[PDB]
Amino acid sequence: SKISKVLVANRGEIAVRVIRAAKDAGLASVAVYAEPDADAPHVRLADEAFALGGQTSAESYLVFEKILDAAEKSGANAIHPGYGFLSENADFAQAVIDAGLIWIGPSPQSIRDLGDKVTARHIAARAKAPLVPGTPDPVKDADEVVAFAKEHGVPVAIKAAFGGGGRGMKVARTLEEIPELFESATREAIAAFGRGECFVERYLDKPRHVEAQVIADQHGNVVVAGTRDCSLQRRFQKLVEEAPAPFLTDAQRKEIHESAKRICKEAGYYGAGTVEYLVGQDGLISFLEVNTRLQVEHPVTEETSGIDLVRQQFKIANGEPLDITEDPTPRGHSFEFRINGEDAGRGFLPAPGPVTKFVAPTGPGVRMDSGVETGSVIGGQFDSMLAKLIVTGATREEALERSRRALAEFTVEGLATVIPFHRAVVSDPAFIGDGEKFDVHTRWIETEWNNTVEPFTVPRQTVVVEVGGRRLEVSLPGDLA
């Protein structure tokens, strides 16, 4: 009738964040591990861990019953998807009801609508959220795209409605691209998402990205923890983010903080998930995405507002009311740099290998949350992420000064990492903001920066045992002799 043991269905950098929040909450806290990670810190930090096995995502985390058996064998009443693998799967979200489990996530039906960026964008307009207005109709055929390309004008997005991870994000810049990019995005969408939907809207010339985090309770209250900027991206992947809102007006800020509640309440929502927007080069704003999950870059919420979002989710699972109610007025500034195994000398190409040391700085203003530990080995079969570096001060440039010390101390040994680029954007003239304006935007990375970096130069065995008529599997090092 209450939460007492909880399964954190995820690895690494979110895994230790959630398992730590469960340890602080005093819950029985359980992890799940793929075979290559059998020595990883994220598989060691939990109280209990269960094997998914296999070496690839299709063999491992994309497989459901391994979690449901870990649920039965632990007795865990509740599963938290974490992010990415399981947080919006409508069949798993009812399989948990067949299994008789609590669901830590969005409403099982609303998953069908919140994922459709057409009718969800109708909902955003209905909620009066900021938008570039685009077309109300999915593309009936390409000549409706050519009509929009004539009347509303190029550049026209041909972006997939169920796209993510940088997939299907494509834009046609000239009329010659429109047909072939619509075609190849359709041929992409039917492969990547099982569905053809994409929609037409004005592509913004030089936007930034901005987000907030939203929290509610089943009793019906809703509060918002903070607004933050995510502008550094490559191949549409996120590289660096900054918080609190550096440059928006109080009108736009207040709209973000109230519309977060509105787009909860009008959906009947009571969960969490980062809300995402872009800022135009002139200070226009457009809505973009209800990221209906924890992004790993949430943790500046503890330094600004104290809220444990996972513990508020536990309070919601208990049906407890919200406590943190009055404005946690934000102070200082913070950046998060994502630490990845990638060679900045050769276009940030990822590389496998061991890490001999992973230097997190010390002192005031610096925090680090990681899923990788000193002596790890890295490979591209899972996410390339290693850790999150969160660094903060009394002002944006003071946080960059503590960064200029901290990241020049921050070092990784044995493998390639992005720290050189983070140092560069910490130092070169374009990114320096005056306190109420800066010039940088998306696609700044593609051509507006200049790169100078030099590149980085036995099995297990199974023994079966029978116990009174049970078959039991036991796994052993192929090493005792």
Among 54, 155, 196, 332, binds a second copy (CB under 8 A): 332
Q: Which is nearer to a second copy, 235 or 460 (CB)?
A: 460
User: Can you say whether residue 67 is alpha, beta or left, with left for phi > 0 and alpha for psi between -120 and 50 degrees?
Assistant: alpha
Q: Which is nearer to a second copy, 33 or 103 (CB)?
A: 33
| Least CB distance to a second copy at residue 438 (A) | 20
Among 214, 307, 415, 425, binds a second copy (CB under 8 A): 307
Number of residues that bind a second copy (CB under 8 A): 68
The answer to whether residue 252 forms part of the interface with a second copy (CB under 8 A) is no
DSSP string for 310-334? HHHHHHHHHTPPP---S-----SEE
Per-residue tokens: 433:
């903001």
Among 68, 324, 432, 453, binds a second copy (CB under 8 A): 324
The answer to whether residue 320 forms part of the interface with a second copy (CB under 8 A) is no
The answer to whether residue 355 forms part of the interface with a second copy (CB under 8 A) is no
Q: Which is nearer to a second copy, 306 or 347 (CB)?
A: 306
The answer to whether residue 318 forms part of the interface with a second copy (CB under 8 A) is no
DSSP string for 147-205? HHIIIIISSEE--BTT--TTTT--EE-STTHHHHHHHHHHHHHHHHTSS--B---BPPS
- Give the interface segment with a second copy, choosing from 89-97, 232-240, 256-264, 294-302 (CB under 8 A): 294-302
Kindly report the length of the chain.
Answer: 481
Q: Write out the H or E segment, with its range, that includes residue 398.
A: helix 396-409
| Least CB distance to a second copy at residue 301 (A) | 9
Residue 114 vs residues 135, 168, 170, 291: alpha-carbon distances, Å:
18, 18, 21, 10
| Least CB distance to a second copy at residue 68 (A) | 13
Among 5, 35, 38, 68, binds a second copy (CB under 8 A): 38
Per-residue tokens: 463:
């023994």
In the chain, the N- to C-terminal Cα span, in Å, equals: 48
Q: Which is nearer to a second copy, 141 or 473 (CB)?
A: 473
In the range 382-421, which residues lie near a second copy by CB under 8 A?
390, 392-395, 398, 401-402, 404-405, 408-409
The answer to whether residue 73 forms part of the interface with a second copy (CB under 8 A) is yes
Q: Write out the H or E segment, with its range, that includes residue 402.
A: helix 396-409
Q: Which residues contact 455 (CB under 8 A, 6 or more apart)?
A: 343, 344, 345, 346, 416
Confirm if 21 and 307 have CB atoms less than 8 A apart.
no
Write the interaction track for a second copy spanning residues 3-22; mark x where CB under 8 A is met and - where it is not: -------------xx--xx-
Q: Which of 128, 122, 74 is nearest to 99 (CA)?
A: 74
Per-residue tokens: 351:
């590389």
CA dihedral 130, 123, 106, 291 (to 10 degrees): -30
The answer to whether residue 217 forms part of the interface with a second copy (CB under 8 A) is no
Angle at the Cα of 394 from the Cα atoms of 404 and 335, rounded to 5 degrees:
50
The answer to whether residue 289 forms part of the interface with a second copy (CB under 8 A) is no
- Give the interface segment with a second copy, choosing from 37-45, 117-125, 155-163, 249-257 (CB under 8 A): 37-45
The answer to whether residue 295 forms part of the interface with a second copy (CB under 8 A) is no
**Cα 313 from Cα 327, distance rounded (Å):** 20
- Give the interface segment with a second copy, choosing from 114-122, 348-356, 450-458, 467-475 (CB under 8 A): 467-475
CA 454 to chain centre: 30
Q: Which is nearer to a second copy, 97 or 472 (CB)?
A: 472
Residue type, 153: G
**Cα 209 from Cα 233, distance rounded (Å):** 9
Among 9, 14, 34, 49, binds a second copy (CB under 8 A): 49
Confirm if 388 and 368 have CB atoms less than 8 A apart.
yes
Write the interaction track for a second copy spanning residues 357-386; mark x where CB under 8 A is met and - where it is not: ---x-xxxxxxxxx----------------
| Least CB distance to a second copy at residue 405 (A) | 4
In the range 192-211, which residues lie near a second copy by CB under 8 A?
none
| Least CB distance to a second copy at residue 362 (A) | 5
Q: Which is nearer to a second copy, 35 or 289 (CB)?
A: 35
Q: Which is nearer to a second copy, 211 or 308 (CB)?
A: 308
The answer to whether residue 459 forms part of the interface with a second copy (CB under 8 A) is no
| Least CB distance to a second copy at residue 392 (A) | 7
The answer to whether residue 464 forms part of the interface with a second copy (CB under 8 A) is yes
Q: Which is nearer to a second copy, 251 or 464 (CB)?
A: 464
Confirm if 50 and 31 have CB atoms less than 8 A apart.
yes
248 CB neighbour count, 10 Å cutoff: 20
Chain position carrying tokens 């226009």: 284
Among 35, 36, 48, 192, binds a second copy (CB under 8 A): 48
Q: Which residues lie across from 338 on neighbouring strands? A: 388
Residue ranges in contact with a second copy by CB under 8 A: 16-17, 20-21, 23-26, 33, 38, 43, 45, 48-51, 69-70, 73, 298-299, 302-303, 306-308, 324, 331-332, 360, 362-370, 390, 392-395, 398, 401-402, 404-405, 408-409, 463-477, 479-480
